[PDB]
Symmetry: D2
């Protein structure tokens, strides 16, 4: 049986195309079993700890126990075939049904920040909708991505699936990626990555879903539970060392509570920098001459980042915290590091205005800690982000401590929000004229 | 006050950008009032007849009485703000809400086959979802498009809307269209047109909705009500002179009812060509050297077409009918003329196979006449079309004799199905952690 | 196989709705509902629209509103104008009759809302015309006929409404007697309706006695309960808006409506600021114990119950009856009393609004749960704290909960959602609509029409 | 710790009142653990086998193999807390949420035909909705019911549930029932039983749901797959020896295919009686002179029934078939036995009219075998049954080979259809005025 890995992109696409044709002859029960099969692969404790541990060691980014939670989140709260609902309308003209049907072959680009959660997430959703998927993994995570694909192909083969429902290439590269985007038998492109690769898949003449970039602010006003907010903000900021694109990247605190917030942040493992000389070193380490993030510090722990400036702290420190002006490079930039600047503002209305401004119109993600229903409503409505989290860690926006399903492909410019099976399906309308209206 | 027509595409876009930002401050009541303004513009009897006269006069395509019905269908059955529904989940983690929020400025490309209906239905849904729209109409329908835009802007001014919610250019052209595709302030493209213009919009780096092409076959098996099927097939095929994208374009009939079906088709106004010489005359009239459809014949009545080959008939003749092999140009090509080839096949399973094959994987529209629930199920399920109509004219898939709403932007390649306000909105998730779970 | 297909050879003075006997009314409704099953959904929709036109016709709108106040002595013309129009515009139609679909390997399952048959509806003297408009739209949209047993105190306005409905439905080609009543309403006739074998379902909008009775008849019954809606205000509320909303909700139709505020439970640190804004919004505050006692004499019977002589009269009127003259800006009578005061414990249905001062927001919630007497009908809260709004709504478990608005926002007037005037109490249907008056049917197409 | 069994009805109601108050403070996650616990009890292979044969042994009704299927259906396909959905509506006036909330203590009356499945189905749905349940079981299934209640109380005790979530009485009697209906703390009665007990619970001054009686016809017309129809009809009629209240109980066949159907009926396990003397023996055995069914024969097998009249057949015989006029006692009566009268009629429309007539305006369950979508629509629309199955066995209407969920409390007069958790909840509406409209 094929393990799903192919030497060329064209060979993988052609096998996925044959596989999806065979897939159309499978029942919905087969789909459910295949979906459950993919959950069982990642939710198996040894494979969970293998994938989490293996991604840290090969990418050098993130940390092990947080990938346990993300990988389990993907396998547990990704919607299966139940996502493919049916609408019906019956009256004098008959019955109309609206269904979610497969697209065909979907090419899927996966990131080095969430290599396995994206594959688990994309695979389950795309296979639920009746598609086959070709993965072009990130080269920094190519061995952990390939191992997951091989494990999935073994499980699906064991469960009776057509071979090659989930395929990838042996040597991931952007050259294979560009061949995937050009291939006539790829009917849909899904890019989870930075804004360059998303613009690329929206330029190939075919249906594309692209993730978005975000610089998520978290506002805290005087009505918030400060103790809980500090716990949630540390947890959300240091989650997988600030790799997730929903992770908090600057605090905008109302002055009335800012100090007591900083106090409680420190209690939860924030390391506060007050010396501008120490702050200067950290700027020179984590930023280029550009002013933006430096790749070698992305995804690193706070303990690690601090050791590089000669400060030795134990494992209880999870984030590095500093109060700075709004113009500081750490607020304007999307560092993807557990370095959390705090801007002090006079009023909640000022906090909302700055949060909107600092969000750079990404319309991606924003967080607020407030119990005032009017202020929660006002900031949510104005900032207009794909995800908005009130009184919890940012990752509650993905189903970890918040209601709803989870995903690791969050659409930016294409508008689908948190993708699921439904997002990988074509809507069909079936009209039974003057019959089956049995009301 | 501005009338909506700008001299340059740049001026139209930026004015639409200003408008959409003002629009963001309006209530849902204001949207509902503006949506009702657009309906009133097109449903006013004088404008309704003026828009249908001008469209035929200016494009030469379609007929007045049927554009009267299609424009009214766009004004009455296009969804409004009630299309913008809300999802809610509540439990131990609080409340999650999912809303349909505005995109921004939408660039919409409109066809010469359906200029006013596309503008009416694009406008309603895009404005219901809180966007502004820049229209880039087809030059063959410039005068009627701009009048309709100016009428919309006038009525919206009377309603107190932000100026320039609906805009276009004075002299529409392909270069204005390309300027609209390139403009950074256009957040989404919507193209109702041929395969080329849909590939263009999917190659711009933006989100695009593309309403592709079809070759809708109609299968008639031995269990059908043949009398009713003949009436439906003529009515659907000839509706607005075969201009609509769903209109019947070739019959595939089981051999045992084929003759009786033809007799009934003739009974309902199909002119049958038996003489092979006359049939060759028609082929040379309506097909170019490369075998493609002649533009001068698109949307012409059967009376006109037959007159061009020396046959004089009265207004009761609605389509031209001919039995031919499956390889015949009228089968393989999409003609958009009330010319309806018939292909005779041995069994209903042969008919389904040929229908799938001749449809050319457009997965757009198919029609079946059959009272056999298993063959209806099999054909609908196998052919995987965006619209499938059972025992009805093709336009029962547009809300005219079938259950559901109407659209004139039917997305094949991009998978949205029958577009409406939802299709022109971003999806946003709002997570209220550990609160508002009042069950 | 057939060479010509399969044709469909087998597919092919006026009553005013008022009857001298309940049994003739029921029998006429039974025949009507059978004819109705031959009508199309389009017919249902024109008939539903025709009911809306009766009550939203400006003449009839004014006539029904004014006539109900003249006939009953309860309520006021301007608000019944608003309530009748609310029933006319925001009562769901046939769109309420949604279809559930499930498709997969075993085919297609459809779930539809189909007619019960003859419904007998008991309507109250408080909202005679709104309940009749609201029931008739919902019940006919679902494909039923309805027999009305109205209250004798509202006989004329109810018989007139049923007659006007029957005239309009006649003009629309409806089967006669889709909506009927009796010429002489009575408790005798109501009992006869509850007992009649051809009545498939009973819908009662009234007090607990009549709700208990319909649940004792051996047939399907919807019971629309009652309660004593508390309005809780805490220190996070917008007090200037709370006071305005509280005056408006309490004085709506002179505190008749099923949801109207009936006691304020105020957090002490904002209590006096609340009272100050309540008087600014048209509250007459009684502070003199002598005068407060005079009003108790007037509005309470010897048995400690409310005087029906005073139910639904304005605050102007009630103050005039104790020698206090005030102009039309006074909308409610307001007084601060202990939690056991009769005005708190009873349900007066009068624009009389006791305020009880408590210490914390958690005491306000506990008291609101207590004074609601486990009706779990309605409660209101003014508060911006998303935790306290959640705690109160979750704990008090009312059918309707309104946050930071007048109570009547729970019926579609200033709040999202549709309207109704039959709010189910014991039987748990919530805000009744066409769906509530339907049988749920399941049609299973085995291994066909799974076209996904 | 309590085992759930109480000496007096009042003690069980008083215990269940305290339990449900305690249940209110449990979480939705607790309910899900308690619902999964009940599924784990009945789906345990040892308990499943014991529950299915102890029911047969104590009641003398049904058969072992089929109760395995039915208890499996109750445990697997009964909806859980996911049944309690949430409606939201947002706009200028804010947010409105609608939720499904507990009633309190529910008194449930279970039948002798489906004692254990009803207890599994009721308690799962009632506990998902946040209720406790006092069962008042049928006296002849006393010992299997109390065992199930004890096993349930043991599992929940192991899950940390409040004591007495599911309770019953030590000696089931109808006077214990009469205590349950009168107890004021019982906020809702649910009677799964005959027409007397249903009228009773509807005469108590409380909210009541009541099961339905039906005389379910199965029409077969000349368009049906007769091989499959006969196989489905035998399997459906003999399912648990015709005990379920959806089972086929008279065939109304179109004459043109009647003899071919009887042929396939016989091949699938139907023993046809043709001799009128043998037929009269069967009536005296299974009927009284009142006309009513003999309780001694209810739920018995076809082999057992034929044995009493001296006829010896093997276990391949599943039902007893006889062609009779429409007025025959087996047509008019409701035998709940694997006895299947067949009526011959000329036309499918006569079959439909006869089906309607013989159903006795119960509007409960009806079946049709036909491939004509017009005739399936006509019969379904006109007969207005709570369940309607097309082209499958009766039990496909309960989710066994048909789409949808399963129940064993099918409402008759009270209208709720197939009960689930929703049916045991109060609809509450929460209105947030001018806030949380975050669209
Ligand atoms: C809540 C969780 C979520 O929301 S999931 C979405 C999170 N993932 C992302 O946002 C991905 C973007 N992240 C970044 O760009 C970061 O800066 C980091 C992690 C540093 C990226 O590492 P870096 O070493 O700079 O490489 P790169 O990703 O920028 O890519 C460089 C070139 O390779 C390409 N590339 C990217 N991914 C793939 C892929 N899966 N397969 C094939 N090619 C890939 C890029 O397009 C880029 O190409 P080029 O430089 O233009 O030649
Ligand atoms: C019924 C529901 C619906 O979907 S609404 C109708 C949808 N209409 C379609 O799918 C396309 C049907 N029309 C056509 O195919 C052709 O236009 C017809 C009328 C048949 C004849 O083509 P012809 O006479 O040569 O005109 P053309 O469109 O090919 O030439 C225009 C070229 O300019 C471009 N163009 C297309 N639309 C616009 C527009 N609105 N504004 C500016 N430019 C436009 C196109 O690129 C087109 O060139 P090209 O032929 O596509 O290569
Ligand atoms: C599709 C799957 C389904 O629909 S299954 C659920 C549908 N409902 C049923 O199957 C109920 C079965 N309906 C029937 O008519 C049964 O055939 C029989 C056994 C005849 C019911 O009649 P019934 O009088 O109740 O039985 P019986 O002769 O043994 O006498 C019992 C007496 O006790 C009563 N009873 C009934 N259930 C209970 C109970 N759980 N607890 C206490 N009492 C009960 C009965 O009313 C009867 O009393 P009485 O004869 O009226 O004085
Ligand atoms: C409004 C109210 C003041 C009625 O005025 P009233 O004069 O005090 O009450 P009445 O004595 O005239 O009517 C009640 C009696 O008539 C019966 N009754 C109620 N409605 C009836 C009807 N439509 N037809 C016949 N009898 C009816 C009741 O069962 C009751 O009988 P009982 O007192 O012997 O037990 C008040 O008593 C009430 O009934 N409130 C509940 C109504 C309500 O709030 N409906 C919700 C509005 S949407």
């Amino acid at each position: 049986v094929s393990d799903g890995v192919f030497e060329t992109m064209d060979a993988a696409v052609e096998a996925a195309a044959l596989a999806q044709q065979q897939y159309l002859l499978c029942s919905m029960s087969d789909r459910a079993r295949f979906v459950q099969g993919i959950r069982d692969v990642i939710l198996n404790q040894d494979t969970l700890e293998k994938m989490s541990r293996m991604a840290v060691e090969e990418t050098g980014m993130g940390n092990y126990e947080h990938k346990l939670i993300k990988n389990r989140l993907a396998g547990e709260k990704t919607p299966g075939i139940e996502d493919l609902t049916t609408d019906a309308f019956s009256g004098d003209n008959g019955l109309t049904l609206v269904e979610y049907s497969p697209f065909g072959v979907i090419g899927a680009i996966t990131p080095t920040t969430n290599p396995t959660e994206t594959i688990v997430c994309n695979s389950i959703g795309m296979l639920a909708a009746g598609n086959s998927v070709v993965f072009s993994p990130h080269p920094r995570a190519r061995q952990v991505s390939l191992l997951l694909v091989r494990l999935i192909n073994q499980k699906l083969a064991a469960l009776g699936a057509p071979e090659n429902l989930v395929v990838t290439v042996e040597k991931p590269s952007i050259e294979n990626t560009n061949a995937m985007m050009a291939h006539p038998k790829v009917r849909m492109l899904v890019a989870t990555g930075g804004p360059a690769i998303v613009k690329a898949v929206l330029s190939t003449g075919k249906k594309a879903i692209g993730a978005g970039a975000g610089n998520p602010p978290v506002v805290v006003d005087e009505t918030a539970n400060i103790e809980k907010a500090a716990c949630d903000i540390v947890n959300g900021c240091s989650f997988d060392n600030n790799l997730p694109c929903v992770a908090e990247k600057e605090i905008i605190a109302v002055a009335q509570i800012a100090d007591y917030l900083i106090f409680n942040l420190k209690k939860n493992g924030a390391y506060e920098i007050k010396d501008p000389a120490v702050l200067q070193q950290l700027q020179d380490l984590v930023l280029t001459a550009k002013g933006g993030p430096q790749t070698k510090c992305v995804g690193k722990s706070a303990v690690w980042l601090l050791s590089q400036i000669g400060i030795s702290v134990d494992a209880s420190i999870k984030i590095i915290l500093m109060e700075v002006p709004r113009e500081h490079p750490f607020v304007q930039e999307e560092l993807m590091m557990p370095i959390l600047p705090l801007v002090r503002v006079e009023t909640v209305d000022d906090a909302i205005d700055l949060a909107i401004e600092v969000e750079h119109d990404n319309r991606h993600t924003a967080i607020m800690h407030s119990t005032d229903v009017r202020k929660l409503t006002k900031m949510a409505k104005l900032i207009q982000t794909t995800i908005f989290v009130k009184n919890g860690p940012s990752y509650a926006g993905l189903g970890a401590g918040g209601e709803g399903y989870s995903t690791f492909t969050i659409a930016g410019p294409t508008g689908e929000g948190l993708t699921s099976a439904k997002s990988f399906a074509r809507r069909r309308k079936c009209v039974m004229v003057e019959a089956l209206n049995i009301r």
